[PDB]
Write a protein that binds this ligand. Sequence first.
Ligand SMILES: O=C(O)c1ccc(-c2ccc([N+](=O)[O-])cc2Cl)o1
Ligand SMILES: [Mn+2]
Ligand SMILES: [Mn+2]
Ligand code: NA
Length: 263
Amino acid sequence: AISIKTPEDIEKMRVAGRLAAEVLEMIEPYVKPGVSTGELDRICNDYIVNEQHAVSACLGYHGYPKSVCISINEVVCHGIPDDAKLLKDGDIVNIDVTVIKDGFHGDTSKMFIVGKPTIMGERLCRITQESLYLALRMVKPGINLREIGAAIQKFVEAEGFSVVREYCGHGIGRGFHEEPQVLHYDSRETNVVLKPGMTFTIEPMVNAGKKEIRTMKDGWTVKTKDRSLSAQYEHTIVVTDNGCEILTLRKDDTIPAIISHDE
Ligand SMILES: O=C(O)c1ccc(-c2ccc([N+](=O)[O-])cc2Cl)o1
Ligand SMILES: [Mn+2]
Ligand SMILES: [Mn+2]
Ligand code: NA
């Protein structure tokens, strides 16, 4: 059931969302050529635990081995931090974070371009973040989630990219994943009219090539079937009386934290 968060819970969600975003702001200086994804994960975990006094919702979830998910280039999601995996110039890397604090979850991720960027890499990431932004600008009471999914897809496909169908955004609160499902493409099964108090994520996964994906034998790593690049950005938001409030905004975001549609 889609729950409406109380003002009190929403504040707890702001706290958790801020922490999740700060993990990403903290890790920035470390995302450099030569660094291992394994070390990046250890830095985030130490920060979450020793500094934020929070916990990673990913650790142990369905047996997931690390504190954050780190996906590089062709890897679509659930990449596993590994000490032998080194970042290099041109890489596009997603670091996905979910922390629990005072019982509530903050879920967010962003792409990082390592060293000297590649134009195609920058473009994929830019378009992906823009697809998230256009969706955020649509969130307000009364709108149907299907309209947002359709808009994300239209935009992405127009750029010659594709949207991954296997994964979606989700309601969030005392639980990591709660109703409703937030598809990033058009579907007849989607009929969710938004209302104030609802909290959920928007996190499109976009492939530069075809939408098809495959999972590696490690049981976790998901890559694009055609080995094209894939990018993802995610934000946790709360629907307000006249729009929405992004709970995981970072200083590098270029969209307002509070979006209002009132005159
Ligand atoms: O941002 C998210 O929702 C997210 C990051 C990684 C996951 C996740 C989802 C489902 C499973 N699973 O084993 O079904 C594992 C993870 Cl780490 O979800
Ligand atoms: Mn996430
Ligand atoms: Mn999520
Ligand atoms: Na990727």
